[PDB]
Amino acid sequence: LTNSSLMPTLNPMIQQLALAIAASWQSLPLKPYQLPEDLGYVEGRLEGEKLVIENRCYQTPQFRKMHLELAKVGKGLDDLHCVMFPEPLYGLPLFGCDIVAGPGGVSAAIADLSPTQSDRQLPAAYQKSLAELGQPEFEQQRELPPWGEIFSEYCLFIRPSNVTEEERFVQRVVDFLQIHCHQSIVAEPLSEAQTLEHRQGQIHYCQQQQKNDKTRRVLEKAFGEAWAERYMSQVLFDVI
């Protein structure tokens, strides 16, 4: 991230999360993942503010696509988006996070390990490890929208109320990533029927994420409807 144009000007929580995700990935058996049109940096404006986006994307044998996106709209909204899309053959859950900030601080902090099984449960090893972290206390919880039925019972969706909560959130994401990277070493390839189940779950996850009109409006204000539809369906939440 030392080469990032956006990092130096992003919200401090976002900065720490970007670093933590990058650190988690740094020693993995990474290969490039080429986004559509080999996208890296992109910017656009229409009648209002400009949107700037920096994309990084990788893959490993366990993760089909590892995408970390940083964005800023003018000087007033920052975002971090990250999804680790699993390879269905290994049946791992989906790691995701979305952090939205403005000049008055973080407005939304979301992180999850989301199920891909038909029964909408995380694998047993994840349930146990997540349970062992304890129920975190956050003063300003937010209710997920209906499309957010895709998220697990361990999903965080808050407005951080103070620095202690920002740090607690980051630490919880660090803990999710630690659990996830360990489970990815002990996963073994699944049966064809199980693989198919997990593929289904990942498709559903992407279709539901595409219902997020708050993201879509940010993109549309800078690039227009057609661009935004392509971005959400081909770059952010591609249906496999």
Ligand X SMILES: C=CC1=C(C)/C(=C/c2[nH]c(/C=C3N=C(/C=C4\NC(=O)C(C)=C4C=C)C(C)=C\3CCC(=O)O)c(CCC(=O)O)c2C)NC1=O
Please report, as ranges, the residues that interact with ligand X according to CB under 6 A.
53, 69, 71, 79, 81, 83, 96-98, 100, 107-108, 110, 112, 144-145, 148, 157, 212, 214-215, 218
Nearer to ligand X, 14 or 187 (CB): 14
Quote the least distance from Cβ 157 to ligand X, whole Å: 6
Cβ contacts of residue 13 below 8 Å, gap of 6+? Answer: 99, 101, 106, 109, 160, 166, 169, 170
Closest CA to 203 of 81, 55, 94: 94
Quote the least distance from Cβ 155 to ligand X, whole Å: 8
Quote the least distance from Cβ 188 to ligand X, whole Å: 26
Nearer to ligand X, 190 or 216 (CB): 216
Q: Is 76 exposed, middle or buried (0-12, 13-18, 19+ CB in 10 A)?
A: exposed
Chain residue at closest Cβ approach to ligand X: 96
Cα–Cα distance list, 66 to 58, 77, 135 (Å): 5, 23, 27
Quote the least distance from Cβ 191 to ligand X, whole Å: 28
| String of DSSP letters for 122-134 | --HHHHHHHHTT-
Quote the least distance from Cβ 83 to ligand X, whole Å: 5
Closest CA to 112 of 98, 129, 124: 98
Nearer to ligand X, 198 or 221 (CB): 221
Nearer to ligand X, 105 or 123 (CB): 105
Nearer to ligand X, 140 or 191 (CB): 140
Distance CA 221, CA 231 (A): 13
